[PDB]
């Protein structure tokens, strides 16, 4: 304001505010393996 | 990585 000495003192602004949304979506994979596959396999396809 | 018939995967 830079209030005067006598001047009946006004009110000043207030900050407005404003939300923003964060909405969390998901992200999946869906690898489909073959039973047998991951039976008689040398690598580790489960951990691959 | 499926079906350990086919080869390519």
Redesign the interface.
């Known amino acids: 304001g830079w209030a005067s000495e006598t001047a009946a003192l006004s009110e000043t602004a207030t900050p407005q505010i404003d939300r923003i949304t964060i909405p969390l979506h998901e992200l999946a994979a869906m ?4 039973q ?2 991951l039976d ?2 040398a690598f580790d ?1 489960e951990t ?1 | ?4 018939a086919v080869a390519a995967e």
Not at chain 1, 31 to 34: I, V
Not at chain 2, 1 to 4: D, K, V
């Open positions: 690898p489909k393996a073959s047998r596959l008689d396999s396809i691959w | 990585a499926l079906n350990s």
